C-alpha cells in the first residue's frame, strides 16, 4: 500500500543523511577545533598570572635586569622571580628530592596545576583519567642528594606530572628548541583528535640553571647588551635571554561544549615543518616559514585576510627579523582584501626570549587580547627596521591601544609563530571562542557564600587575601560567579573557611578578615574531617516568635510543613502554619500541646532541607 | 522516457557509493596501516646490520 516511489524516497534520504554524518566525521578527524580551556603563565616581569602579563604589556614595561645572585653564576637578562620556589609538600615530595629536582620540573608541576584551575577542573576528578601531558623542554645543567637522575631526565618532566596527578594518557617531553612548546601543542591536538586522550596539558618550561647558556651565547654574539629584545626595530642588536612556564589545557571543542566548559579560544589549525637545506644549521629560511604559515591556513580553512593579528617569533636579531618580516609580507601582507593592515608584535619585547616557553607565552598573550577584543600590545622601541619593506602598508607594528577587529567570518583570529635554531618551525591559528549558548533550593538569598580551601592555615589565609585583592581590583564581577567558581571549579582541601556577603565590597572586607585571624560576624572556619554527621534533635527550649517563618517559602521546606499540617489538623484542632505564620486566633505557642508538635514539624522540615 | 524508478535508482546507487568512500576515508584517517619500508640497526654484538 506504499508505492515504490515512497519507499525508495525514505532509503535515499537515509543514505544521504548517513553520507552527511560520514563527511562530518571526516572533518572532525582532520580539523576539529581544539578548545583552549585553561592557561597558566609564570614568566619574567613579576608575571605569575596570565592577567599579570596583560598588565605588563598594556603598561609598556619590560623586564630586563641584571642576573640574580641566588643562582651560582656586564650581564643582563630576563628572570622569573620564584624560579627556585616550590611547594614540595603540596605534591607529596620530600625536601631531599625537591632539592635534587631541576627547577624546570618544579615550575611545570606548579604551572600545570594552575592551568587546571584556570580550566575550572578540580584536579582530583582527573585521577585515572585519560589525560595526556606534552612538555616542550630542553636539558639545562642544574646538577653539574639522590633522586638526581629522576630529577634531571627530560622524560620525567612530563611523566612526573602524570604520576603526581595520576594521569594515564601519553606523557612526552619534546625538544625542537624555541618551537618546542608549539610543537608540544601541535602534537597534543593530533593526540586529542586521534582519541589517544580526552584532555591534554601542553606547554613549555625553561629556567636558566647551569653556567653554559648565558656565557655560551655571549661568545656566540647573539645577545643584546641591554638584555632587551627590540623586534622589528632599527635598534635591533640581539635577543635578551629569558625563561618561564606557559601551559594550556586542550580539549576537543565538541567535548568542551558538552561539559559546559568556558572556552578561552580555539586552535583552528597548526602546522610544523622544517627549514631543510638552508644556509646553515642555524640559519632561518624565509621560504620554509611561508610553507608553514600556508599549511596552517590550509588546516584551519582560512586565508591570510582572516587573521588581524600576528604574534611573531620576534627575537630582535638584526638579520633574523627581516627574514621573518619577508615571509609575513609574502603571506599575510598580500591579498589583505581591505581587511586593514595586519598588526604585528612579539611578547619578547616585554619578557625576553623565553626559549622552550616562547611559543605558548605567545598564545597566552593572544588569548588575553581575544578576551577583551583588544590587539595585544608590544613595546616597539625606536624606529621600524630599515631592512624591511613596509611600503605596501599591509603590515603594521601593534604599537598601542588597538581594537582587534574580526574577519569576514565575524571571527577574531591570530597567527602565532615559533622558529627553532634546529630548523623546526611552527605556526598556530588561534580563533576566538564560538558562542556558548545553553533549579535551586534555598531560592531567594540576597547574600552569597564564598568557600575557601588550602592544605594549611597560612595557605588558607593567603588564598583569602589574594581573592580579596582580585575582587577589589575587579569590581563588577558577579558575586554568583565568584561563589560558583570557588565552590565547584576548585578542589577542597582540609583547612576551610567561608565568607557570606551581599556585595563585592562586603566580600572583600570579610575575605580580609579571614586573611587575618579575625572572628567577625559573617565568617566561619574549620577543618574537614570524615567520620560522618550526627543530627541532634534537642528537648524543650528551641521555640521563638514564628520561628522559621522566613523559611516557609523554600519549596522543600513548605512541602514538609504541609504534611504536618494535614496530620496535625486531624489529630489536634489546629495546624502548624497557623502557629508559625501570622496567628489569626490560632493556638498559643505557650501551650505544651502546641509547642511540641510545632517544634516537631520545624525540626523534621529543617532536617529535610539539610 | 526514463521512468522515475530508473532515475532514482541511479541517485540512490551514487549516494551509497559515496557513503562507502566516506567511510573508507574515515578508516584511513583512524587506522590506515603504516608500511615499514626500511630499517637499519647499529647495536651491540658487532651488529652493524
Amino acid at each position, epitope marked *: 500500500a506504499s508505492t515504490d516511489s515512497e519507499k525508495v524516497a525514505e532509503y535515499l534520504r537515509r543514505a544521504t543523511l548517513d553520507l552527511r554524518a560520514a563527511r562530518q566525521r571526516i572533518r572532525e578527524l582532520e580539523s576539529e577545533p581544539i578548545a583552549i580551556v585553561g592557561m597558566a603563565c609564570r614568566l619574567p616581569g613579576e608575571v605569575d598570572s596570565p592577567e599579570r602579563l596583560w598588565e605588563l604589556i598594556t603598561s609598556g614595561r619590560d623586564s630586563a635586569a641584571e642576573v640574580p645572585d641566588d643562582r651560582g653564576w656586564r650581564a643582563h637578562g630576563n628572570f622569573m622571580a620564584g624560579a627556585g620556589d616550590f611547594d614540595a609538600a603540596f605534591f607529596g615530595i620530600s625536601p631531599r628530592e625537591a632539592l635534587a629536582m631541576d627547577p624546570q620540573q618544579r615550575q611545570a608541576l606548579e604551572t600545570t596545576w594552575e592551568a587546571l584551575e584556570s580550566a575550572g577542573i578540580p584536579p582530583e576528578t582527573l585521577r585515572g583519567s585519560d589525560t595526556g601531558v606534552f612538555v616542550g623542554m630542553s636539558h639545562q645543567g642544574y646538577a653539574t642528594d639522590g633522586y638526581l637522575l629522576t630529577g634531571n631526565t627530560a622524560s620525567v618532566a612530563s611523566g612526573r606530572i602524570a604520576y603526581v596527578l595520576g594521569l594515564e594518557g601519553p606523557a612526552l617531553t619534546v625538544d625542537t628548541a624555541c618551537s618546542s612548546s608549539l610543537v608540544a601543542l601541535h602534537t597534543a591536538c593530533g593526540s586529542l583528535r586521534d582519541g589517544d586522550c580526552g584532555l591534554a596539558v601542553a606547554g613549555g618550561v625553561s629556567v636558566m640553571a647551569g653556567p653554559e647558556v648565558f656565557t655560551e651565547f655571549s661568545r656566540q654574539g647573539a645577545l643584546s647588551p641591554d638584555g632587551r629584545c627590540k623586534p622589528f626595530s632599527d635598534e635591533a642588536d640581539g635577543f635578551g635571554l629569558g625563561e618561564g612556564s606557559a601551559f594550556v589545557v586542550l580539549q576537543r571543542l565538541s567535548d568542551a561544549r558538552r561539559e559546559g566548559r568556558r572556552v578561552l579560544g580555539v586552535v583552528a589549525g597548526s602546522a610544523v615543518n622544517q627549514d631543510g637545506a638552508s644556509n646553515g644549521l642555524s640559519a632561518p629560511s624565509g621560504v620554509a616559514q611561508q610553507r608553514v604559515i600556508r599549511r596552517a591556513w590550509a588546516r584551519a580553512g582560512i586565508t591570510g585576510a582572516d587573521v588581524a593579528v600576528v604574534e611573531a617569533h620576534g627575537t630582535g636579531t638584526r638579520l633574523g627579523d627581516p627574514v621573518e618580516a619577508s615571509a609575513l609580507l609574502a603571506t599575510y601582507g598580500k591579498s589583505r582584501g581591505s581587511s586593514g593592515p595586519v598588526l604585528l608584535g612579539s611578547v619578547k619585547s616585554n619578557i625576553g626570549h623565553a626559549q622552550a616557553a616562547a611559543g605558548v607565552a605567545g598564545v597566552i598573550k593572544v588569548l588575553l587580547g581575544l578576551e577583551r577584543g583588544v590587539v595585544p600590545p608590544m613595546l616597539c622601541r625606536g624606529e621600524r627596521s630599515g631592512l624591511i619593506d613596509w611600503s605596501s602598508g599591509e603590515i603594521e607594528l601593534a604599537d598601542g591601544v588597538r581594537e582587534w577587529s574580526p574577519a569576514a567570518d565575524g571571527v577574531r583570529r591570530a597567527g602565532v609563530s615559533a622558529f627553532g635554531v634546529s630548523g623546526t618551525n611552527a605556526h598556530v591559528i588561534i580563533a576566538e571562542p564560538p558562542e556558548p549558548e545553553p533549579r535551586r533550593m534555598l531560592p531567594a538569598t540576597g547574600v552569597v557564600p564564598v568557600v575557601l580551601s588550602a592544605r594549611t592555615g597560612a595557605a588558607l589565609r593567603a588564598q583569602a587575601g589574594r581573592l580579596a585583592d582580585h575582587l577589589a581590583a575587579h569590581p563588577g564581577i558577579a558575586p554568583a560567579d565568584v561563589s560558583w567558581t570557588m565552590a565547584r571549579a576548585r578542589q577542597h582541601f582540609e583547612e576551610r573557611a567561608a565568607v557570606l556577603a551581599a556585595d563585592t565590597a562586603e566580600a572583600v572586607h570579610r575575605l580580609r578578615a579571614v586573611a587575618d585571624g579575625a572572628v567577625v560576624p559573617g565568617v566561619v572556619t574549620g577543618s574537614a574531617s570524615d567520620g560522618g554527621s550526627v543530627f541532634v534533635f534537642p528537648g524543650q527550649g528551641a521555640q521563638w516568635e514564628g520561628m522559621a517563618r522566613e523559611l516557609l517559602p523554600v519549596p522543600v521546606f513548605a512541602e514538609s510543613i504541609a504534611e504536618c499540617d494535614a496530620v496535625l489538623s486531624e489529630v489536634a484542632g489546629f495546624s502548624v502554619s497557623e502557629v508559625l505564620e501570622p496567628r489569626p486566633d490560632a493556638p498559643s505557642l505557650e501551650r505544651v500541646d502546641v509547642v511540641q508538635p510545632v517544634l516537631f514539624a520545624v525540626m523534621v522540615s529543617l532536617a529535610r532541607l539539610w | 522516457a526514463s521512468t522515475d524508478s530508473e532515475k*532514482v535508482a541511479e541517485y540512490l546507487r*551514487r549516494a551509497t557509493l559515496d557513503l562507502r568512500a566516506a567511510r573508507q576515508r574515515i578508516r584511513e584517517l583512524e587506522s590506515e596501516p603504516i608500511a615499514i619500508v626500511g630499517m637499519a640497526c647499529r647495536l651491540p654484538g658487532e651488529v652493524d646490520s
Partner: antibody
Amino acid sequence: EVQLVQSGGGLVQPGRSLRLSCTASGFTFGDYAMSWVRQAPGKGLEWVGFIRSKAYGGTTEYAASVKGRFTISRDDSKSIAYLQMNSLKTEDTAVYYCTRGGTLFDYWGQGTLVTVSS
Amino acid sequence: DVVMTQSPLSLPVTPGEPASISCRSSQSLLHSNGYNYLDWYLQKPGQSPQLLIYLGSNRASGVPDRFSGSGSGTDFTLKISRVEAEDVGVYYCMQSLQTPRLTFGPGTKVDIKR
C-alpha cells in the same frame, strides 16, 4: 579503480560502418546503464543513446539523428558496451564518449575520435 | 511544456577568490521525495566531462570540497569557495525532471580573469 577504456575509432569514408568499444573495469558493469555522448569539433555535448541494465530490461533509446543508423549493444560477460555506427556521415564526425549511467553520468571514458571524410 | 534551464554564458574567475554560477529552470525541479533533480558537470579544456554535484547539493566523492551546490525549486547555484587555476572549462547544469536530454546546453565558459 573504476575504468572505462575506449577504443575503436579513426578515419572512415562516408556510408561505411564503424564499431566503438567501451571496456569497463573496477565495478559491476551489469548493474549500470551505459550511454554514448558525442562532441563535434568545437561544439557541445550531444546525447546519442543508451542501453539500460539487464535488471531494467536491457533496452535501448536513441537520438533522432542516429535512430535506425546507430545501435547500442552490451556484453556483460566481457563487461563491454558497444556503439555500432552505420551509414556514417561527415556530420557524424566527433569525439564519442561512453559514460556510466543513463541519467546520472558519473564516470566517463577518455573518448574516441571518429573522422568521417572521403 | 518542455522544461528549459538557463545560466551565465561566460564567467571570468580569479584564483583564490570565490566564484558562483546560477542556474534557473522554467518549472520546479523538486520531486515528491524532497530532492531537486538537478546535476552539475564540468568539462575541463581537452578533457572528458566529470560530475561535480548531483541532486542539487550532494557533492560526489572525489570532487574537491571547494565545490558546492545549493538552491531549490527553480533557482540553483554552484559555488567554488576559492577558485584554483585548474577550475577553467565549461560547467553545465542538467535537469533530470524530463528525459532524455538531447544536449547539455551551451554551459558556462569559465576562464581566468584579467
